[PDB]
């Protein structure tokens, strides 16, 4: 109580200082309070530049999280050198996560607070929500017994979707399969290696048969779909000293991936030798829930979670010399701490078209689109 009050004051005072220092650290900071908090954020891949205008239009997939109100899947537009909701689609319960299919960015899968995983083609619904408040997904993907968060599309196999669930399983669907009644597709495969809540799943970005999963059992598992046994992964890695909440494959380094954990660390892994962690990124003060590699720079990654402050890392600086005073602030590979949020970060996304732009969303309804200044990452 007293202790809670002190933390709240520290957070607020730090935010006031952060605010006054933004010109030194950013080239852009746009803050926007959403009607409802979003648990999810992902930039869509396409940008629209208007004739004779000094800005381009980028788009984001967002969701709502309501108390006792109708939820929606949202497409928002963002003008980059205003934020508007363009498309609003009825969704059953909060949108735990929403991700577009690489081969057709009109297609979006969502995780719900139920066992169903949903698919929408957003161009095949009205831009304004149906007044009935009824959710009408284009597909219902069944196979789980519980809700979950992890979701991953195979960028080399059209329509191959993986999903992680609190039921301890991973479901795979090919959404091109012929649906039965109620537009249902049953899981093509179910992977049962984990012994606890599965938090995240991710396809390898080059090898179409490989994927990884992470769970509350503290394991990272590497799976190969060419194997007949779905109860035993190709590799089981003792990854962390607490729950593993996220993983991300490096788009430019085919052997490298990262995992983020309740143990406050991001671990770096080399698929050629998973017996030994390659590196441990330390600095976060609380549980990490999301980790994403930069779409533009192979050494750059970011992580976020309960400590409210997204960290950006540059693994090119691992082992570099720094003053002992600098060491007090963190390891050499810590590049940036984003101080813009005062609540837990629920998700974030790197802009795929404008380097160094990130959108992050937090539990207090805030969405921020921001770009660190060149003086941070250059030299």
């Amino acid at each position: 109580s007293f202790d809670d009050a002190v933390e709240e004051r520290v957070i607020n005072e730090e935010y006031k200082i952060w605010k006054k220092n933004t010109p030194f650290l950013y080239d852009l900071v746009m803050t926007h309070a959403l009607e409802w908090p979003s648990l999810t954020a992902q930039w869509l891949p396409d940008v629209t530049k208007q004739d004779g205008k000094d800005y381009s239009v980028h788009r984001l997939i967002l969701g709502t999280h309501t108390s006792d109100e109708q939820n929606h899947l949202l497409i928002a537009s963002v003008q980059l050198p205003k934020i508007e909701i363009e498309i609003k689609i009825n969704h059953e319960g909060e949108v735990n996560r929403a991700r577009y299919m690489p081969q057709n960015a009109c297609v979006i899968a969502t995780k719900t607070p139920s066992s169903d995983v949903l698919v929408f083609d957003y161009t095949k619904h009205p831009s304004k929500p149906e007044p009935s408040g009824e959710c009408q997904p284009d597909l219902r993907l069944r196979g789980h017994q519980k809700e979950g968060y992890g979701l991953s599309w195979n960028p080399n196999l059209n329509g191959y979707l993986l999903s992680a669930s609190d039921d301890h399983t991973i479901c795979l669907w090919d959404i091109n399969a012929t649906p039965k009644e109620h537009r249902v597709i049953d899981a093509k495969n179910i992977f049962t290696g984990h012994t606890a809540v599965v938090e995240d799943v991710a396809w390898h970005l080059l090898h179409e048969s490989l994927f990884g999963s992470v769970a509350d059992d503290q394991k990272l598992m590497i799976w190969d779909t060419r194997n007949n046994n779905t109860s035993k992964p190709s590799h089981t890695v003792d990854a962390h000293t607490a729950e593993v909440n996220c993983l991300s494959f490096n788009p430019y380094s085919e052997f490298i991936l990262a995992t983020g954990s309740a143990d406050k660390t991001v671990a770096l892994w080399d698929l050629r030798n998973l017996k030994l962690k390659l590196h441990s990124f330390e600095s976060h003060k609380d549980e990490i829930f999301q980790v994403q590699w930069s779409p533009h720079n192979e050494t750059i990654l970011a992580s976020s979670g309960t400590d409210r402050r997204l960290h950006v890392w540059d693994l090119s600086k691992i082992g570099e010399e720094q003053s002992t005073e600098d060491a007090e602030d963190g390891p050499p590979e810590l590049l940036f701490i984003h101080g813009g949020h005062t609540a837990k970060i629920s998700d974030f996304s790197w802009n795929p078209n404008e380097p160094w732009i990130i959108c992050s969303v937090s539990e207090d309804n805030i969405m921020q689109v921001w770009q660190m200044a060149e003086n941070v990452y250059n030299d």
Binding site: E14, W18, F24, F336, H338
Partner: peptide, 14 residues
């Protein structure tokens, strides 16, 4: 200075 900025960056703007 570039170093001052990187320090401020690593300290989260505080």
């Amino acid at each position: 200075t570039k170093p001052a900025i990187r320090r401020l960056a690593r300290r989260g703007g505080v």
